[PDB]
């Protein structure tokens, strides 16, 4: 199904997304989300996908860095990124760990370190 995407430029509606969500391909969704640079929902897919396969087990810390490699100057749509990070802080530490999480949050936002007292 991946090869059809460049030829499928005549149709990129949300209806195609519904079928992939139903069958949970977990790869075409990430590939599509990289195109329009939404980066929000795909970020959920970074931890939503319980399985690993090839999309995971590689660059696990670096995938988070790459998705966080966005909006250098200012907020620029990353406010929802901060809010979804805040709302899912607890299970994030379960996957990545502890020592890497503080290093990742150090260069991004000190206030994100505030959400530790709960």
């Amino acid at each position: 199904l991946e090869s059809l995407l460049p030829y499928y430029h005549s149709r990129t509606t949300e209806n195609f997304i519904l079928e992939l969500k139903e069958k949970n391909f977990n790869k075409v969704l990430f590939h599509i989300y990289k195109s329009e640079n939404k980066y929000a929902s795909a970020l959920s897919l970074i931890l939503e996908t319980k399985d690993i396969e090839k999309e995971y087990n590689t660059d696990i810390v670096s995938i988070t860095d790459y998705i966080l490699k966005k909006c250098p100057p200012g907020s620029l749509e990353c406010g929802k990124v901060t809010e979804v990070i805040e709302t899912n802080f607890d299970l994030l530490l379960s996957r990545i760990g502890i020592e890497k999480c503080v290093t990742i949050f150090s260069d991004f936002d000190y206030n994100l370190h505030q959400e530790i007292l709960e």
Binding site: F30, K54, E55, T58, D59, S62, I63, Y66
Partner: protein
Amino acid sequence: IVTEETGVPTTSISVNELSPTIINRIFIIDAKNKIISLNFVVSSAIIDIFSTSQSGKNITYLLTSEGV
């Protein structure tokens, strides 16, 4: 041994174009004790290997595309 990898593809990185083939990396594995002898880079490629010497010591020879 001689090793050819030509980069590595993954979802996180983006392949800009047809990346030039990284030149062969050469390893010399050792028996008995576990150690790596040498690891350097060559110019273009390898055609054939001779690897002979009459003396007590032994020497090896490689021939690349342009010829070294």
